[model samples]
Target chain A: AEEMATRARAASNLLKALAHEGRLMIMCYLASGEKSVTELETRLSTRQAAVSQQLARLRLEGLVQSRREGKTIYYSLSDPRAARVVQTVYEQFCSGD
Target chain B: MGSDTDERSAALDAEEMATRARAASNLLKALAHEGRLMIMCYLASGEKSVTELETRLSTRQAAVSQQLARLRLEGLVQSRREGKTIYYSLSDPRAARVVQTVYEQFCS
Candidate 1:
């Protein structure tokens, strides 16, 4: 019945999911390519638990994909729609700062 | 002696063009909707009348205005009336840029 509304909700889910400092930066960084949880922890200058929480939400939302290799998990941007938003954040905000 | 509040006000400078994250995130929330985002993108191209919006959006009058109201409340859009039509355009530059981004990303 609500086709457009359904589409909007999907987009809104990604936006709200990324409406945080940690999640936004995480996606922006992953836009370039994959990064491990430890790399994100270092980039964010925070605890593994915090980084993992953000990653967990992102992963659950399907904005990111995680692959395990040798006891390490790496994440990359998985959705085209989200990658566009992430790209905008990088070009508009992260690039200058 | 209690300059704590004074310091708090000044500390916003510490914001740094600085953590634009929150401001940008607010923009995200405002632009979150497909209806709202599409409206912003349309305004990004140029100004348009409410009737024009209804034409392009193919939706009911109240629904389109409600979406425009949401963007106006968030400061993402501005309106002016000419003759009988109220025209709206993208007002915030950052938001305008994001709409451009959305268009290139999705439309193209």
Candidate 2:
């Protein structure tokens, strides 16, 4: 029972992280590869500051990574565990399968 | 996942639909942002970088970086360095397709 509670709690945290539309979109983008701060803004047509704030929240939750190149900073989805979760989403939502 | 609301009008089984909705919403919850949606869309073509993404984007640095971090933590994208530039690509091809589907269906 205790172990089940822990599992449920963990699952709940995962749900909470993805509860918002913005965060979900972020994960969807990274599902393929890495993107830079500027690229994300241009594609989404959103403000840089707002996007960064959301990304920071994601980082704290351990969803993505940052790599600095010259003056550019790149972000990517590198967690296999989360990728599996994303797969589950694709299966259920995208495919209805 | 959030509660299912479509049960009132449809004749479909509520319990089953709710279960499906939970599972689907839980998954969608992780992968449904405009920036993230676009990233998944671009990856459908091939891998690219932060600079590439920046060029593709309509905004600036802090925003893109932050969303990428979120996806990274979630295990959606991966990175490799080439010289000073870092290259990013999709971690799962199937999931990438799914993201594309969602983008077309929901985001317009």
State the lDDT of candidate 1 residue by residue for B15-100, as single tens digits. 33326555667778788777786676567668888888888876676889899998999898998987988989888987776666
Residue-level lDDT tens digits of model 2 in A1-97: 2332344344446555655555555665676578888877765545778889878877887878889999988888866555556555544332223
Each candidate's DockQ: 0.27, 0.05
| Pairs in steric clash, model 1 | none
- Candidate 2 structure quality by residue, lDDT tens digits, B18-54: 3444555544555545556556555556788888877
Worst 10-residue lDDT window for candidate 1 chain A reads: A88-97
Worst 10 residues of 2 chain A by lDDT: A1-10
- Candidate 1, what DockQ? 0.27
- Misplaced by over 4 Å in model 1 are A1-17, A45-50, A92-97, B1-18, B105-108
**Poorest 10 consecutive residues by lDDT, candidate 2 chain B:** B99-108
- How does model 1 score by TM-score? 0.71
Interface RMSD (Å), every candidate: 4.5, 13.4
